[PDB]
Design a protein around this ligand. Sequence first.
Ligand SMILES: Nc1ccc2c(NCCc3cccs3)nc(-c3ccccc3)nc2c1
Ligand SMILES: Nc1ccc2c(NCCc3cccs3)nc(-c3ccccc3)nc2c1
Length: 333
Amino acid sequence: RPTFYRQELNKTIWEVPERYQNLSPVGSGAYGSVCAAFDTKTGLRVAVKKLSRPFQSIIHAKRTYRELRLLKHMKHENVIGLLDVFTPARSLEEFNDVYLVTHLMGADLNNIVKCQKLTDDHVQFLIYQILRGLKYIHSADIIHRDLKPSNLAVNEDCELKILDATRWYRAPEIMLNWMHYNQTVDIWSVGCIMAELLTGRTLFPGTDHIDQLKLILRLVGTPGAELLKKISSESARNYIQSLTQMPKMNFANVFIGANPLAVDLLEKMLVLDSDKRITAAQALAHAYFAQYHDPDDEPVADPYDQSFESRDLLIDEWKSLTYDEVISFVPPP
Ligand SMILES: Nc1ccc2c(NCCc3cccs3)nc(-c3ccccc3)nc2c1
Ligand SMILES: Nc1ccc2c(NCCc3cccs3)nc(-c3ccccc3)nc2c1
């Protein structure tokens, strides 16, 4: 129904509704390539992502369905969402390309830090938005698992969105391949991010996988008696006992000059035991965010049906389910 036009971008033929003008490449990768554009219907600058080989295999097809289901479900100011999704195909039989459209963001978190301290007012506002979006994501029973400055976009008014080395911000239970980690692995990442904003430097800049765990234990101490009781691995538990004990450090002496409320929040985020970590909802009520907290405007998500993750289907079945989601899409107001 919309009039499409073809154009040569990256190494391939983009077919795109005429409402999107001035297509200009921004990136590339195994799973897709992205162009910046201008949406003449809305007047917004947008990013258009063309999925790469979306139905080449069963794995690609399930990936394409997962990515579209996820981005269609996210409707929150501090999480990336869909402005549009389209295909040049007029029927399922000729359905072979998928394009996703989102609001163009000018920079990520690295771009605003630049190895410099942010003010406490600024960190308050940025971490509040991350936690606000995290509360929404976690309420849908989703775990992000890869929170880091490059996965956090910010515009010129400092409005932040969570996007779709990484080990610097990874929770220690992931580093040790524990099977049953919970949502507070993301809270660990936010603690690492917040520390970096206040100090201007990476909190745990490990040079490899084992060095990363070494730096973490030097700050938060060796596992306590109560945490060792919950470790099922006999090899892990034995190795931990053989280590020289290290005292949990006093964050107030580590982050000198910081807001004491900021230090108290970091203490509650960077706990080794993930069962004792503050949740996103609890962190929003912390006194550190007094000037931004509003419990009437920190919404949760609708329930998100993730049962498809357990399913093994054929290429054409994932493709047809993906086609259903393209057709049923409703643009936001
Ligand atoms: N971790 C990242 C990093 C970059 C990203 C990026 N391109 C950078 C320019 C941006 C456009 C919109 C938000 S950010 N774009 C998209 C994306 C674009 C369109 C549809 C779905 C996703 N995700 C990103 C995830
Ligand atoms: N209820 C909990 C809470 C936390 C846990 C945790 N956290 C990581 C603790 C350490 C991280 C680095 C050195 S010790 N790690 C493991 C675990 C680690 C290795 C093999 C099997 C399980 N279980 C946990 C269960």
